[PDB]
Subunit: 333 residues, 4 copies
């Protein structure tokens, strides 16, 4: 009569997952921002866990769980989970890789176009009461807006989102380069893109750089005071991937000195983001969104139902065979 | 030793046009917003005129000119000039149709994506100090953001910009319809688009309506209290064409009642636009830009040099034969 | 009780048109290749005519009709009808411009790919018993086959078919140029194509030239011994437009001397075409189809029903107001 | 003073590879179709081997080599090499995956269009002396030609070539499905394609099926008398992948009975192919090419130089670390 316990760590709404898990698991929520906010009953008894990106799990946090057997990220990125240590401790880790691919690529194009066309900043200026009566004033208030055709878009990481962004960028006349040191040669040919070997070549040729790679152990602060100086003078930066990829200290100074003309960020080193705190406090030409590139109503529901199904499959079947999107089979023992 | 006079009516900067017209015409500027601000010497002697969109010329204004022989719009739209009366009075009228086609389509896609992805509004909320720490809060602050694939984009006017917008929209998964009662049948087939016969059919099937037609004598307030009720509940409206095409009274009420979920406007019935005056004072979910969809540095220079060349051709050669973009040959006599 | 007479001049099958015209017109067929094969009753009484491309109507032929009031081409091209003289004689002339736009563009791409990839010729060689056992033999038998990406496709005439061909060619990595002296500037920008001013520039830069213009009074033998020498050495020629556009004498010699590497022709100066007669008797590297680029079952039915509707509209209503695709309103009096 | 020996097994031309390998290896050729035609000196001393697709290497053949340390396929497919046994015997096996991706996709589109548009068959009929004078005769001779827009293209294997084919097919109005049981979910979203789970679903919904998968131990005769009956009545089949994927016995009967309207094959169960021998002797509506989809001059040179570089890297450096495209690291010991 006793069912396994499944806990939603960093959230409270479990409505979407309930119809899928009802006869399979007891569902609880912790609304927790850190391991320190999880009830002892969860740490002791929880067999499965559902979590988003707002809580981090180190080996230290993972060891506090005594019965945990699977974690499912309701989302694609899993940089916030110590994946190797989880596998060592016998804990499967899964993600939901496909629900928000095109939502995120559309948000990226929106940010790219917002930098080239300055629509967001032009809207601000009108809210700020700027009067734009003459053509000379239009040119002034829209100064910096640029023609897109012929510009070079450099994509770092050509996966699901990177490929979706590349196909969209081609429609606006962008010349699309990409740097992805983990793909085998020939993907540039299938999609009709130009590829480059080193990050430096990408940054050297790109008028606008957009990040679409996972945050892993080898690319923290991939954009830093060193690689920032490799970018074109007056280039754009876009990041809907992970804030850990950008040294905001170096970015702030680049915006202030004009080396980088503008930047659009949906993710940040420390989230939630605030224009009043952080290295970007006073950085100019800065567009930011609160980690919402992923969100649509259909994407939210899609990933939550898929996450719930993965939980069911883990409880009902055999780990890790029954799992569709386990990302640490190599480490599981 | 005496050269013809050419006047820049609603502007002062003539730097781009000077090298082209130096040995051909004396160049003056009026920096005028209305006919009432033009020096008598210009009205009497001016043989050619260069103007943008910030001044209107009625038959009354046109009759005040005694020597005028050609007007050149530095831009594509010429709804601000009485074209038939100008032809009656023997005044050629030309435009520059191609300089900003893709700048304007890129601005349109930026506004479309800004409505579907709410990037602009999400940026505002962060400037307003909203804290978005949890996923529930992300869903809340980004409420309304929608998946684009499967959505129907309805294009009113499938000319230079409309076609550029259609090709771009297809890359995001839009289903593209268009209504253009002046094209012959078969253009929908060449570009792989679906066409509809009546404005009502366009509005009935479209999740997002975007205007790309000229403002002519038959489509003032094309969007009005009658046709607004023909649009889908919760649809988007985009207008980078002409503000005269939209009854802002009807639009404001539709935004307030939620019939229209959001609207992005680069043009307005009365320009310059102000969020503090007009029928849109208090309208919600409203994005606006100060008639800047056209602007890039390369587009501004391109159209100004082309405009200057048209002036040269008029003075040097025969009107209207030597003109490349005269838009009123039928009326000229 | 007496209905108007409508005659299918160069055909016999009227099944598709009958349900549309039953209560409107008496339908007869002539199965005629020339005016000399039309029954006197048709010449005297026929009020409307339906015809394809296999019969020509000069002023001489048109004058033999005494009651004719409208001709409808079941197809887009109407170069086989003296359009000006028909208008002089009070005879409306209409076409069906849209039924086969994409069928014809698909046939064109098939011919283009058949030249670059030599699939057709490679199939012939296998029917001829050629044994291709080694790689050296594959290279030999497929000699001439070329990589498409980077190649320049030059389009002459950027209308319905030309635009459909341009969009398809871009997907294969072609660089697309076009020459069309009748379009206003700005269409190259909407579709993201490069335009050229003179036929010579088109031929000078193109690795493969494809014809998509109407045959009019100013472009007979557009490709001739003079303009053929303006083409790139070893270029391809494709013609699914009209055979009258190409001087086959000049073409034959160019194929024989290797100046042109290969040619694909769906239309010819004299049709039907035969590899045993004509200036192309012995021309090498020649692919030909019997004027079938237009044909699909859905296209044949679509244009025949549309043609029948145009006939109905002419009889039932007022000429030329009620006509949707009259191509000689300027001449009708 | 003694260099390693490198042998071109199934070819004689080594000109492209010589400048790259001169100071690294002694180069010989065998022009051999089977292991039985290789000189004893090669079998004993050869340290490296270059081969195409015209010779097969079983464990039996591999064991005859005494010094062989690396095999390099000048091409992407390596189904003709026992890869597991080669790794067991300590023999690295590499391929060249990218040189002909777009050549092969262009050949595939040529075959697809040749079936839908019947250009090849229409050319044959003209060579056979068929006279096509009337429209009724055009419809007759081109019977079977079909409109492409709305048709469903089913891709089996969505790798380098499959993706290139998908993007091209979208430009013609195809609805593109694909079946690839080895990809993780989310690739359909990045490229805007519809995916299906089982081969049966692919065949059930597709008007035209095209094969783009490797020939492996689990898909020999993937198209067989069982799966052929799962295809749509009157569907098309295209195969530029591997002939071993199709049971030609089942295919022949399907063409004869009309279940399959037509088939285009660049590869065959037994190559070289002959219309006079094999299960396809008398099959109708059959287009064939002699395994030439890969060939362009630039592709041939590109893959041969890359192959030579891989050989150099193997001799000069450490196996398998220094290899860029080793396809059997898992088996090498
Ligand atoms: N802001 C948001 O709400 C969302 C953020 N994302 C983020 O966007 C990123 C991309 O997501 P997907 O495309 O689904 O991931 P994916 O796994 O499909 O693709 C990631 C690609 O990045 C490449 N990569 C890894 N390290 C790299 C490096 N140092 N340099 C260049 N390339 C590298 C990999 O080879 C891989 O191809 C992820 O980090 C994910 O967290 C994704 C969706 C929504
Ligand atoms: N905000 C800005 O800075 C810019 C605004 N524009 C405006 O955008 C509009 C489109 O410009 P282009 O594409 O260059 O014009 P265009 O002349 O190339 O195309 C206009 C099309 O609209 C169609 N049309 C006219 N009346 C219509 C109606 N009642 N319903 C449906 N279709 C109708 C015409 O048939 C024509 O095909 C113009 O009004 C122009 O003023 C253009 C560029 C920049
Ligand atoms: N083989 C077949 O069964 C078929 C043949 N066709 C032919 O293909 C041709 C194109 O058809 P559509 O695209 O429907 O015609 P369209 O009227 O849509 O376009 C024709 C274009 O050619 C341009 N043009 C005219 N003379 C020119 C010259 N000297 N140089 C460059 N451009 C020139 C015009 O400006 C126009 O834009 C027609 O001649 C038609 O007869 C069309 C369909 C099927
Ligand atoms: N005729 C010619 O000259 C040429 C032939 N080819 C052939 O075309 C085929 C594709 O080549 P690439 O795209 O470079 O290979 P690739 O390795 O890039 O892609 C192969 C794809 O097929 C999939 N696949 C494997 N077995 C499958 C099955 N049973 N059902 C569905 N999908 C399956 C794999 O998941 C993989 O994604 C190869 O077999 C190759 O030999 C390639 C180039 C030229
Ligand atoms: Ca720049
Ligand atoms: Ca909606
Ligand atoms: Ca060449
Ligand atoms: Ca069918």
């Amino acid at each position: 009569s006793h069912m396994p316990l499944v806990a939603l760590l960093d959230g409270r709404d479990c409505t979407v997952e309930m119809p899928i898990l009802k006869d399979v698991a007891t569902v609880a929520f912790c609304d927790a921002q850190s391991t320190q906010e999880i009830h002892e009953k969860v740490l002791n008894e929880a067999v499965g866990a559902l979590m988003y990106h707002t809580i981090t799990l180190t080996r230290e946090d993972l060891e506090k769980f005594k019965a945990l057997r699977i974690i499912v990220r309701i989302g694609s990125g899993f940089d916030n989970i110590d994946i190797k240590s989880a596998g060592d401790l016998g804990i499967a880790v899964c993600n939901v890789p496909a629900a928000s691919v095109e939502e995120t690529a559309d948000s990226t194009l929106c940010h790219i176009l917002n930098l080239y066309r300055r629509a967001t900043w032009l809207h601000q200026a009108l809210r700020e009461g700027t009067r734009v009566q003459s053509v000379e004033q239009i040119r002034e208030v829209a100064s910096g807006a640029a023609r897109i055709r012929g510009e070079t878009l450099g994509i770092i990481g050509l996966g699901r989102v990177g490929q979706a962004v590349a196909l969209r960028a081609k429609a606006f006349g962008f010349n699309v380069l990409f740097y992805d040191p983990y793909l085998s040669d020939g993907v540039e040919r299938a999609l009709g893109l130009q590829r480059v070997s080193t990050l430096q070549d990408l940054l050297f040729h790109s008028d606008c750089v957009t990040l679409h790679c996972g945050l892993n152990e080898h690319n923290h602060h991939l954009i830093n005071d060193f690689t920032v100086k490799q970018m074109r003078q007056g280039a754009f930066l876009v990041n809907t991937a992970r804030g850990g990829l950008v040294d905001e200290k170096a970015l702030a100074q680049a915006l202030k000195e004009g080396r980088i003309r503008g930047a659009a960020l949906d993710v940040h080193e420390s989230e939630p983001f605030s224009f009043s705190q952080g290295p970007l406090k006073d950085a100019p030409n800065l567009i930011c969104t609160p980690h919402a590139a992923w969100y649509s109503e259909q994407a939210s529901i899609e990933m939550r139902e898929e996450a719930a199904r993965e939980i069911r499959r883990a409880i009902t079947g055999r780990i890790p065979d029954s799992l569709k999107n386990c990302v640490n089979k190599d480490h599981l023992t």
